[PDB]
Amino acid sequence: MRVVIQRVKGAILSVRLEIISEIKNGLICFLGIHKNDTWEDALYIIRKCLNLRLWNNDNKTWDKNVKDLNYELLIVSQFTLFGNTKKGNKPDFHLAKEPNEALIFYNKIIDEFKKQYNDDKIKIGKFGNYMNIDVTNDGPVTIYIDTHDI
Amino acid sequence: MRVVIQRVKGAILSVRLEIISEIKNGLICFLGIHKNDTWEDALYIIRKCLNLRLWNNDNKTWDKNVKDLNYELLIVSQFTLFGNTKKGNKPDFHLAKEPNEALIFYNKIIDEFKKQYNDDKIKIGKFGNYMNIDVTNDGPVTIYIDTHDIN
Numbered sequence A: 001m002r003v004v005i006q007r008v009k010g011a012i013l014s015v016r017l018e019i020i021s022e023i024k025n026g027l028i029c030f031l032g033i034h035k036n037d038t039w040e041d042a043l044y045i046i047r048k049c050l051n052l053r054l055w056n057n058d059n060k061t062w063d064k065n066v067k068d069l070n071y072e073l074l075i076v077s078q079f080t081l082f083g084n085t086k087k088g089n090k091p092d093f094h095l096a097k098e099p100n101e102a103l104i105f106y107n108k109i110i111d112e113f114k115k116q117y118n119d120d121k122i123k124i125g126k127f128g129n130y131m132n133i134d135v136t137n138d139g140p141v142t143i144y145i146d147t148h149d150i
Numbered sequence B: 001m002r003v004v005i006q007r008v009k010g011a012i013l014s015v016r017l018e019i020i021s022e023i024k025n026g027l028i029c030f031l032g033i034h035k036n037d038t039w040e041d042a043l044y045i046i047r048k049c050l051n052l053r054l055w056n057n058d059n060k061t062w063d064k065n066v067k068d069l070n071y072e073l074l075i076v077s078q079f080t081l082f083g084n085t086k087k088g089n090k091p092d093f094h095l096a097k098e099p100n101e102a103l104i105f106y107n108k109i110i111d112e113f114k115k116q117y118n119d120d121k122i123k124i125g126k127f128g129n130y131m132n133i134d135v136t137n138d139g140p141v142t143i144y145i146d147t148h149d150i151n
């Protein structure tokens, strides 16, 4: 499983154009889901997202995590992360989980996100649909995790 | 070398704030240089950045690249990509290249980008400075490349 975590002042997610999602300060989380992810993969992700320490605090660095600062999370599904760029300039996304069944997985993950923090503080995007998101990158801080490194 | 590439309608790169960079359509690339990166490691990035066909063009999808549609690239150095998070919740940047050499390897990379696309098309941040980037994520579309899985 694959996540890009970008630290943000805020985020505003939009479909076709309308704002349906918003966080002010927090993390944006681009979530790619391999065809062979097991629930465990989804735990590791959920965990680190909440748990990683991407904020300095009062003369200390990399110290407080989302939860601590009472900050939100914008979870967007992103298969393009299994974009394969070793064939050629066109990317084949084979290695990503099939949308109809990936959608189940996402939702599970989104529920468990809430149970692992505070439902009031987890936002999402429309799975199927094309999205336009305005991001304020704070720093910025980009962090990559491929759960298949365990 | 690591890189995140997101397709975007535009971007604004401000510093501590007063602005320094805009792009309309195109790509933004957070690029992490690994302590050991050869010049090859660069090229693969640069090559794959310009040439990746990420825009639907006509009734075709995943077809046209950034140089084709005549779009910009904003290149933001981002060590936190070698934030080792595997063990611990405090990220571990030991695989990252020192900011003094990093600066020129980044420079050299920016040259080559220009040198290969166009001087006006390549935009940047202020290396290793707190930056703020308004990014209009179109799609969205995100691509990882670790140049170390390449043979």
Ligand SMILES: N[C@H](CCC(=O)O)C(=O)O
Pocket: A128, A129, A130, A131, B056, B061, B062, B139, B140, B141
């Ligand atoms: N690669 C993007 C995907 C956006 C979508 O999910 O529709 C596109 O073709 O527009």
